Symmetry: C2
């Protein structure tokens, strides 16, 4: 009975014992990964809090795909902060495909990480990944819509759009049914509802208009056209990485799987939600570090 703990909200995966697993949103071994005013205070809080009900049997998955024991993370806290893709990438390279591209999209960013010969070959820092099509700052929920493009086709004409914070990808996702209303968990830009109509109201403000000047069908069309711009952003980046590493297989996961599938039809797609369930797909890092800890402790 080993647990996979991803503190960012927090997700827990109960692994081991023939394979009996389950995840929950908020034990002999615990894999601790943190994807979440100096950033050394919270680090101690997390570490010390972990010791409380888990003891010393805690393995921390650092910035790299390396598992460091406790106290090692207490000494040099500059390794505790980990990405939301490193753990998943490691897991994929040893349990799904050794030659592929992992594409994960959360509420804010999309990670496109090449895996070659079983090893993760993505660049290190965020800057380096932005420079190599391995980090795309578009997410399922929090992306301001004009980041997808400052012009949009509206009623057949290329139209300029507002730069003000009015609508986000969450609005597009709900209107196009790529995520449920319940999955629109971030704050709405105007402090109002997450239902479709409320989302259409927000989207209409992008064109300095409202649902009195334009119809709901017109507004929905704005969402549809932005969705295609969004798909292209995902596709172009994955293609660039694929062209350099010769990979054709893509493993997708995260809240944005539906969007990922739509954008990457040109590739051989392997869905985490389809192979391990939607729960794992929504809590991949926690499940990943759980499987990884198992194999490493089984190395004995």
């Amino acid at each position: 009975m080993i647990l996979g703990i991803d503190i960012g909200n927090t997700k827990i995966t109960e692994l081991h014992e023939n394979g009996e697993f389950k995840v929950h949103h908020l034990v002999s071994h615990v894999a601790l990964v943190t994807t979440a005013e100096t950033k050394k205070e919270g680090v101690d809080n997390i570490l010390n809090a972990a010791e409380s009900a888990f003891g010393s049997n805690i393995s921390v998955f650092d910035s790299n795909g390396n598992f460091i024991s406790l106290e090692s993370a207490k000494t040099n806290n500059m390794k505790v902060s980990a990405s939301n893709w490193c753990g998943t990438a490691k897991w994929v390279s040893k349990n799904i495909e050794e030659n592929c591209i992992l594409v994960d999209m959360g509420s804010t960013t999309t990670d496109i990480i090449p895996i070659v010969e079983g090893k993760v070959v993505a660049e290190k820092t965020d800057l380096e990944r932005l420079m190599n099509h391995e980090l795309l700052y578009v997410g399922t929920l929090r992306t301001p819509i004009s980041h997808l493009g400052n012009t949009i086709s509206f009623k057949g004409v290329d139209t300029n759009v507002s730069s003000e914070y009015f609508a986000i990808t969450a609005d597009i996702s709900v209107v196009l049914e790529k995520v449920t209303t319940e999955e629109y968990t971030c704050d709405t830009p105007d402090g109002k509802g997450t239902d479709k109509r409320s989302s259409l109201v927000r989207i209409s403000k992008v064109l300095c208009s409202d649902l009195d000047q334009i119809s709901e069908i017109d507004a929905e069309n704005i969402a549809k056209n932005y969705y295609e711009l969004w798909k292209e952003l995902i596709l172009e980046n994955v293609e660039n990485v694929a062209e350099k590493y010769g990979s054709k297989k893509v493993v997708i996961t995260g809240l944005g799987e539906n969007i990922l599938k739509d954008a990457l039809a040109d590739f051989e797609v392997i869905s985490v939600a389809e192979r391990y369930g939607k729960d794992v797909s929504l809590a991949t890092p926690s499940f990943a570090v759980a499987e990884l800890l198992k194999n490493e402790l089984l190395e004995h």
Copy 2:
């Protein structure tokens, strides 16, 4: 002395235009969503010397939770308590109407930030040209044909016809200019987070002065070039420990190119449609506009009337339009 008063949502601009042509522009903080006592007080200092007043309200303030009637009524009452019936209100249609006419037809009082300026240009500057006014947030590209302003009616229609562009000198989030930028020779994706704005680019490239970076900084830090480069570096999820000052300035220069191109393309489209080669520029962003529209025949409000007028054109414009009507029979 003629007074041109432009009441915005939070800031009021007053132009004192003297008979000899000398002028002075005053600035006053006056939130329209609250009581009008301060406005009334300031306007009263002109009560016994001024009888010719041009008043315009350009307040947009999107959702201010206040009816148009109360907003207009409060402004008109503050002005009336100082000048009585001696007030000419510039309405949305670009015409001067009486104080009583404004009260009655309150729904037609509030004007766009460019309405007065465009009409003034059409009368006092050039009858066939394109007005390009870039303030802190938007860029208005308004065609003037045969002395008549012929821009589209609504903002949506202007967005569909290259007459409204959401790029400004200070408040534009940098990624709105483009979600990728050339860096060290390769196409680089950029953050969507609110970390840097056009004000940062403007200060770093000296298109505006540090004192002119009047909006809040994204991180609440300094408005100096160093602090601006720090914010700009965040757009590529970096910092001045990972990249250099030269690197950060290169990010700013590359974005400046995208920014100028956005302005140019929009102005070119309006110009090609009307066949005009003359552009009249104004607003805090004149330095950027001069660079972007270098190939056009440029007429600068700042050069012809001074920096203050360029940064408060609406108030000056209605003062001039009032002067025109007055001189009509002098």
